[PDB]
């Protein structure tokens, strides 16, 4: 579209991972990466 | 969280590195050296489809199928206390035993088709 | 001149609300409390 | 949090199931019976327009006069820091006693004309 | 140019900052904000990464 | 967190007041006086600039100089577990000295050029 429409997200999917991390982070990093969006920033929803 | 209405439930997309992705998630961590922890996240399905989605997170020291049972039943209570018609749940758990420092995480992602 | 494109820009607007609620867990305590205060059916993004 | 300048407070506007509200928040849970749980907002508003408003939040185990006297005085407090004249103090407050389980919550939602 | 980049997905950032504050306060809240001040970013929205 | 591909360090520009900044940061509060409070925040960049980077936060009662090590090491590591060439690690630490009650505060925000 040459003009941006203003959308609501339209897709929602479901990930799960684990890991194990030499720090909290690190294995929190690591089952992102296992749940295969470790690459992206994630925006907590609450 | 909540799912907006008419939104589909898809297989994770192609995600451009760095994007910010709203994500609701549940995440645990533990140091303790045998300990079973898990993650688990549900999405109640309305009936009425102008009605949005209900996604629920939990996490606990436990098995797998019990925070999966434990998460579809909080997406339950979500839609009996707003009296809307429930469709169906879908959900996804993991479950870890820690080496020595372990997470576990489920996660919904909302993102752009 | 009619404004295009405002939800690309900046939020103008703010609102006060507030609310409580009992609850089976945590979470579906909270998801009340927000219910309660009419925001119950919308992602937060929580700003700091 | 920070309303931006020119921003105005209004009342909460139909906002559309799902969007993704940037939200300014303070919360409380107890499961202490008999418990009195309190969460509050506040907006302090400059008299000079170009610049911004201030959003605080606060929770506690209060009523929900001290919980929205406090937090006034937190939002006051952050204009004397910044040494910015003050217009008014906007806010709001809520209290719960809990009977099993229960949550006070208290926001300042950033949404669109 | 304004942009909420929680509606604008398409469009990432393409910069990166790093700074740091500290700060004494009266609440806990007002220390947070005092900090943020000394760091330079105490009058905008954080939108927390993880 | 992730720092986009291509993305450039730059000092922290002038943000309008008001601004939604996406943003990776530790923080830790005190009320012990005399306590030494510390964060640190470090980007991990690339050699391949079509990868991104890792952002890492940190914060603890410490030293600057061991909670810069400390974060330091964790972006190390997060390349390490991804199996990516580490072309080098931007850092920023800050310590304080709790009087009464104190913040100390490190962050990455990620904005636009
Ligand atoms: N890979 C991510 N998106 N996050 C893991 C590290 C989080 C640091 N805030
Ligand atoms: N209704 C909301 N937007 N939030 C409450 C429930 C949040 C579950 N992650
Ligand atoms: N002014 C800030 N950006 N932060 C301090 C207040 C955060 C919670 N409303």
């Known amino acids: 579209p040459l003009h941006a429409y203003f959308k609501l997200p339209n897709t929602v999917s479901l990930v799960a991972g684990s890991s194990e991390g030499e720090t909290p982070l690190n294995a929190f990093d690591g089952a992102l990466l296992n749940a295969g969006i470790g ?8 | 969280x909540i799912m907006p209405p008419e939104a589909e439930i898809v297989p994770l997309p192609k995600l451009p590195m760095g994007a910010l992705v709203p994500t609701a998630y549940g995440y645990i961590i533990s140091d303790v050296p045998g300990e079973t922890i ?5 999405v109640a399905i309305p009936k009425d489809k102008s009605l949005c989605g209900l996604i629920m997170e939990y996490e606990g020291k436990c098995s797998k199928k019990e925070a999966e049972k434990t998460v579809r039943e909080m997406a339950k209570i979500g839609f009996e ?5 429930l469709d169906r749940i879908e959900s996804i758990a ?5 080496e020595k420092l372990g997470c576990a995480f489920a996660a919904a992602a909302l993102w752009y088709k």
């Open chain 1, 39 to 46: 690459n992206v920033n994630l925006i907590r929803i609450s």
């Open chain 2, 81 to 85: 206390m707003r009296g809307w018609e």
């Open chain 2, 38 to 42: 898990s993650a688990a996240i549900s």
């Open chain 2, 94 to 98: 993991v479950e870890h035993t820690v």
